[PDB]
Design a protein around this ligand. Structure first.
Ligand code: NI
Length: 1352
């Protein structure tokens, strides 16, 4: 593998691998931040004599096009000149394998044919930072045995070198004669002239054209110092001084030449302008445009008499164009022909031809638009995250806090609605805290009441998800917003409705020739677009789905598009967004045909979404904040880019890294991860690891250590989207199925599959090696494509720890880099970071020595938004005590990953390897593992053995408390009772245990076991426990200090113990627990805290039956109920815990200690899941139907009954008042008849399947019979459930657990129907009793929340 160095004149050397022509070359080293269009870019004549450093880390994906083909004009069909014009090329990663429908060969082959040197494996970000702001950096690509000297190609006249040597004519026969002066013109200039009716006479740079006949003249170019082109400058000067009045249009070099000819000065810029995201402002009318630029010389801003500036650079104030005051002469410094780059300024060609066609010495101003007073807002109502919408069920969006922040900076008063009293959104005490908060449901009724009370003049309805949008739209339609004088801020409701209705949407798009059948196998691309009130419009992020709504593997930026495809879609995005009148943020999704330019629009979303959140996290561009400012009528150029500080929101980010997002499935998605790397492979393997700790990376092995079935149909597994498809792909490759076949079956673009094949080949290479034979080079490469020490250890036969030691002995370690939004074009002081093996330096200093706080990882069942609240509180406590903080998390749906709230944010893996990397590189003073759920807590001991100082409760004690055997022996000694239990190995040991304590029994890897047969199936180390029947469950949440409980709260589950404890509804304080049991609970907690020397948060769960109290388990960390308990009691338990763990003294006088609890007297609090849905055990271990749930709603009420009803309304349900479907197991009839009568006596009409209806009627409780879903149409007499739910006859379903395998399917269907129709579903008897009691006591709805003040 042949190597070479890039060597700069300042001494910098980087070693890389040759992929072009293997010979040395010297030139000016430059960088360009444009991501797309490398084939077009490297044929730009402006690069003559230059060694080009690419910002885009991943280069070569589309190979090289047909480089010999000509179009009808005799120009290169696919390129911008007749060959590669760069002197050399520097890239981070070169794709050897390419895949694109226009590709004819690899980029390397093309570079070899053209004799151009190129190396990969160099840190292009570091190069960019070195080159930046130093006028001319000279360098060379040097091969061993081929030494060269530094040379500056700008000292020769490069214009002359690239110019045509003879006159050439394009568009022969066309009616408008245009002379084009070739100073290194790009082909697209000619294409655009000819398309507009020009016969183009392309003349040499030094051709005396001054006496030629022509209708118009254009001067275009790229390379070199324009001052060396004196003969051309002289000739242009003769035109300027003659009586000739033909329009003159200068492009880039043309701006410099025209300016020089007129008497202006040029200089070499210390910071060149080279990218596709260069914002310019039209000085006359203030319109902004994104442009492509590639120039290193500029015009002095002091112009001679008769000339005026036309465009200015928004970032650096340099001239971007000029015009004559009265004659049709003008020029621009940027390239409106782009290729590559944004098609935003092509209208300048139209302008040119208009000047020619009119032809009475008009000015440029008169053939461009003229200049145009904004919305005045004193108080704004922001609709926060709310309850259920049909289809968008379980969605949450806390971006309203960024809106609050934006409004505050503009001195606008804020009112926020969010019904959850323990929401992270309302756990804010600074700039993100609303002036007034209403804890009311996001529904039209309640929103109307807040409007009456507060009289806001503005409403924000697009930052609280679907429910908030629907609520706002509904209020508009009813005339409520008009009646109270409330302006919808941002995109109007008319426009929103057009995006929400498919027909209206189709109609609107047809007015601009865009349209909308099967598009499976098409590439799915999305763009995030921002548009301000003044019609400025930028694309902030683009994304490509890897596989085949929002449950895909996604990468950003898109990887497999050409410039032409990317810019065509971008352009359409911008047109659609303008035509719809978007004022704010917008998401647009496209399907693109994989082997042509055909596309269509799938949808547009005019509210903040998952995509907009992903885009902000991926880019560092704060969409929600900016959208809120835009809603006040502030234009993009008047808003600051908070990452660079020095520039504005009016730009398109360039990324010098790649992002991978992967859904987290329940082991249909429950959460997501995002990883950052500088190869696809690094990003991708990281993201896979982030999903679950049992996933090693990209391998042919399944999560959770499961083995593949023996009857596996691999082709079938590939052709069906599922949560394990990625592992199946790895298997298919490993079993030597061709990539073409895999592509056919999966629709995954082959480019991604080549990367996946490369990972598997590295695994094979590693398996043949050992700790003595593996070279530095191979290990380096493995780490650069995302291999963990764990993966490597398995291949080499070592432990993880030995592998880490081996790697550090070779001094192979990762590097900390900033996400700066600009690919280092400008220095950033951002503290938003990631870690990569693909680099040669760190972007920050390591002098803070801060306190590390570990986040929770992806959300999933049992691990939700509650840990986000805990992180926020802990981080804030540290900051308020003046402690520096380092936060680590990889969950892009979290609020706590806010780089403004901590001093360093690492958006990184929560593995032992990566946490050690960060901790030791920062030399942190400590690490808090207690506030991020299970992930961080399981790392306690490993971290401790690797030099990490864990704060609070010792890791040795955590290990003891969570080892079941040791924990259980400690309880015995303390005389604290527990549920009898056993660890079993043999199936027979299970029967022996079950025998000695009776069925049913519980199982942990939590599932119930009714019979011995059922036990037999489950083993396809396992713990068995007996729970008592009819027990209550109680949670103890507490904070210990030196083994003493200094804060505690006891909550009672509504549900009897047994049905999973993590979706249980909690009541605080307790409702039906005896006083003696409470005392025993306290006493057991006292002893437990002392036995494990607790300093920090902890949780203990108990079974209570009468006076019997049994410990179930102890978690030596904060639990999901810490926020609930804190808000209910008026004391932040995390703040107390964080203080204890870092040794900050705390006053116990007013805390809820065991001796003096805090027990609310005037109110009760309830915590319930936000969303619940049924799941069928179709996997076939047992046939059963369970509920799963996620999210949180917490409310206060005078008692638990009114709290419960408030929680039902807060989740977005209507309190039932018409009819109830009753489904119960036959054996449960005697126990249910009482509640059935009670519901009926409240006026509910009862419905049930036939046998149950007959049973009710025979017991004098009236009931109407209905059909089992599987038996509909077998009896016309009986009505269908679906129909009765649709007519509104049934507005509540009770469906209690049912073991009868005959009706498990129907019961699942019934449950699914209730959920899909948005009506409350009760699946537990105690909950059902609570509901029946509550409707008895209650009335209407507004009365429950009636401005009650809750405290103490
Ligand atoms: Ni410029």
């Amino acid at each position: 593998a042949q190597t070479a160095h890039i060597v700069l004149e300042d001494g910098t050397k980087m070693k890389g691998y040759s992929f072009g022509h293997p010979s040395s070359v010297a030139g000016e080293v430059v960088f360009n931040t444009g991501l797309g269009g490398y084939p077009e870019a490297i044929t730009d004549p402006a690069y003559k004599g230059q060694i080009l450093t690419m910002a885009n880390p991943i280069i070569g994906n589309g190979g090289a096009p047909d480089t010999t083909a000509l179009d009808e004009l005799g120009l290169s069909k696919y390129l911008e000149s007749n060959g590669i014009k760069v002197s050399g090329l520097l890239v981070l990663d070169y794709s050897k394998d390419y895949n694109h429908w226009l590709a004819t060969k690899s980029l390397g082959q093309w570079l070899q044919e053209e004799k151009v040197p190129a190396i990969y494996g160099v840190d292009t970000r570091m190069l960019t930072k070195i080159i930046r702001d130093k006028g001319t950096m000279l360098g060379k690509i040097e091969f061993e045995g081929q030494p060269v000297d530094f040379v500056d190609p700008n000292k020769q006249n490069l214009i002359a070198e690239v110019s045509t040597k003879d006159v050439k004519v394009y568009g022969k026969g066309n009616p408008t004669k245009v002379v084009a002066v070739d100073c290194g013109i790009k082909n697209n200039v000619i294409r655009l002239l000819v398309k507009r009716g020009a016969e183009v006479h392309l003349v040499p740079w030094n051709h005396d054209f001054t006496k030629m006949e022509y209708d118009g003249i254009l001067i275009a170019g790229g390379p070199g110092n324009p001052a060396l082109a004196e003969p051309l400058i002289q000739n242009v000067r003769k035109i300027l001084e003659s009586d000739r009045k033909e329009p003159l249009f200068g492009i880039s070099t043309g701006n410099l030449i025209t300016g020089l000819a007129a008497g202006a000065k040029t200089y070499k810029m210390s910071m060149a302008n080279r990218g596709q995201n260069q914002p310019v402002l039209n000085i006359t009318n203030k319109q902004a445009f994104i442009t492509a630029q590639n120039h290193g010389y500029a015009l002095d801003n002091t112009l001679p008499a008769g000339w005026k500036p036309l465009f200015v650079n928004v970032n650096d104030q340099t001239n971007e164009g000029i015009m004559h005051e009265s004659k049709p002469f003008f020029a621009v410094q940027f390239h409106p022909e782009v290729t590559p780059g944004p098609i935003d300024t092509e209208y300048l060609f139209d302008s040119f031809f208009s000047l020619i066609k009119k032809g009475k010495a008009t000015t440029i101003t008169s053939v461009l638009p003229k200049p145009a007073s904004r919305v005045e807002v004193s108080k704004v109502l922001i609709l926060g995250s709310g309850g259920l919408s049909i289809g968008q069920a379980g969605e949450f969006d806390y971006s309203g806090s960024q809106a609050v922040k934006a409004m505050k900076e503009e001195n606008v008063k804020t009112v926020l609605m969010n019904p959850n009293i323990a929401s992270v959104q309302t756990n804010e005490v600074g700039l993100k805290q609303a002036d007034t908060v209403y804890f009311l449901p996001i529904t039209p009724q309640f929103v109307t009441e807040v409007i009456k009370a507060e009289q806001p003049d503005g409403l924000i309805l697009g930052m609280g998800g679907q429910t908030a949008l629907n609520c706002g739209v509904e209020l508009f339609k009813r005339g409520v917003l008009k009646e109270y004088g409330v302006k919808v801020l941002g995109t109007s409701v008319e426009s929103i409705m057009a995006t929400e209705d498919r027909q209206l949407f189709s109609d609107k798009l047809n007015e601009i020739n865009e349209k909308i059948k099967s598009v499976t196998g098409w590439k799915e691309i999305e763009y995030e677009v921002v548009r301000d009130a003044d019609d400025n419009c930028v694309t902030v992020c683009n994304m490509e789905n890897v596989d085949a709504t929002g449950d895909s593997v996604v990468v950003a930026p898109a990887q497999t598009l050409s410039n032409a495809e990317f810019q065509m879609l971008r352009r359409t995005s911008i047109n659609v967004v303008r035509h719809l009148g978007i004022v704010g943020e917008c998401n647009i999704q496209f399907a693109l045909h994989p082997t042509s330019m055909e596309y269509c629009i799938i949808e547009v979303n005019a509210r903040l979404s998952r995509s907009s959140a992903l885009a902000s996290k991926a880019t560092g561009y704060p969409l929600a904040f900016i959208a809120a400012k835009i809603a006040l009528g502030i234009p993009l150029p008047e808003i600051k880019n908070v990452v660079s500080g020095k520039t504005s929101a009016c730009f398109e980010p360039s990324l010098d890294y790649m992002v991978t997002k992967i859904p987290r499935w329940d082991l249909k998605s429950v959460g997501e991860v995002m990883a950052i790397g500088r190869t696809f492979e690094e990003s991708f393997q990281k993201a896979l690891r982030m999903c679950h700790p049992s996933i090693e990376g990209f391998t042919p092995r399944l999560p959770m250590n499961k083995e593949w079935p023996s009857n596996l149909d691999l082709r079938k597994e590939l052709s069906e989207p599922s949560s394990t498809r990625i592992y199946a792909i790895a298997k298919a490759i490993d079993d030597n199925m061709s990539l073409d076949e895999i592509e056919k079956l999966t629709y995954i673009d082959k480019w991604f599959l080549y990367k996946m094949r490369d990972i598997l080949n590295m695994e094979k290479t590693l398996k043949g090696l050992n700790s003595e034979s593996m070279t530095e080079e191979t290990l380096k490469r493995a780490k650069e494509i995302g291999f963990s020490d764990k993966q490597i250890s398995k291949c080499l036969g070592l432990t993880e720890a030995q592998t880490r030691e081996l790697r550090l002995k070779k001094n192979i370690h990762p590097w900390v880099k900033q996400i700066d939004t600009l690919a280092a074009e400008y220095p950033s002081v951002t503290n938003y970071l990631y870690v990569t093996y693909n680099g040669q330096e760190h972007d920050v200093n390591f002098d803070d020595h801060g306190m590390m706080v570990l986040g929770c990882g992806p959300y999933h069942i049992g691990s939700s938004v509650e840990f986000d609240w805990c992180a926020v509180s802990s981080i804030r406590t540290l900051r308020q005590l003046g402690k520096k903080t380092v936060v680590v998390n990889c969950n892009p749906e979290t609020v706590s990953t806010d780089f403004d709230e901590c001093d360093k944010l690492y958006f990184e893996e929560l593995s032992l390897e990566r946490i050690l990397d960060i901790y030791h590189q920062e030399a942190c003073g400590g690490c808090i593992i207690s506030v991020g759920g299970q992930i961080p807590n399981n790392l306690a001991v490993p971290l401790y053995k690797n030099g990490v100082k864990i704060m609070g409760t010792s890791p040795l004690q955590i290990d003891r408390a969570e080892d079941r055997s040791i924990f259980s022996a400690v309880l015995d000694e303390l005389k604290v009772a527990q549920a009898p239990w056993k660890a079993v190995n043999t199936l027979n040991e299970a029967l022996e245990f079950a025998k000695s304590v009776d069925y049913p029994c519980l199982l942990r890897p939590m599932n119930v076991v009714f019979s011995e047969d059922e036990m037999k199936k489950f083993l396809e180390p396992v713990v068995l426990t007996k729970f008592v029947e009819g027990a209550r469950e109680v949670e103890m949440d507490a904070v210990g200090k030196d083994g003493r409980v200094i804060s505690h709260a006891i909550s009672e589950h509504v549900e009897d113990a047994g049905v999973h404890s993590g979706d249980a509804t909690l009541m605080l304080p307790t409702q039906t627990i005896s006083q003696g049991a409470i005392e025993k609970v306290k006493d057991a907690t006292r002893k437990i805290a002392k036995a494990f020397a607790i300093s920090g948060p902890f949780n203990v769960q108990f079974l209570v039956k009468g006076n019997d109290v049994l410990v179930i388990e102890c978690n030596l960390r904060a639990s999901r109920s810490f926020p609930f308990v804190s808000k209910t009691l008026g004391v932040d338990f995390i703040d107390v815990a964080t203080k204890v763990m870092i040794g900050e003294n705390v006053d116990e006088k007013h805390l809820p200690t065991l001796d003096h609890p805090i027990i609310p007297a005037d109110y009760v609090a309830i915590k319930a899941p936000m969303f619940s849905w049924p799941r069928l055990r179709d996997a076939d271990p047992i046939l059963r139907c369970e509920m799963a749930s996620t999210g949180e709603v917490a409310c206060f009420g005078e008692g638990i009954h009114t709290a419960f009803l408030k929680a039902m309304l807060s989740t977005g349900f209507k309190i039932p008042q018409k009819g109830i479907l009753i489904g119960i197991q036959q054996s449960f009839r005697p126990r249910f008849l009482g509640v059935a009568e009670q519901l009926h006596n409240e006026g509910f009409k009862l419905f049930a399947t036939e046998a149950t209806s007959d049973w009710l009627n025979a017991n004098n409780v009236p009931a109407t019979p209905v059909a089992w879903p599987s038996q509909e149409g077998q009896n016309p007499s009986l009505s269908s459930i679906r129909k009765l739910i649709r007519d509104g006859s049934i507005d509540l379903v009770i469906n209690l657990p049912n073991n009868n395998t005959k009706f498990v399917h129907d019961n699942y269907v019934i449950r699914r129907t209730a959920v899909d129709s948005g009506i409350p579903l009760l699946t537990n008897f105690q909950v059902t009793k609570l509901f029946a009691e509550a409707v008895q006591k209650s009335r209407d709805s507004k009365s429950l929340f009636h401005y009650r003040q809750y405290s103490a």
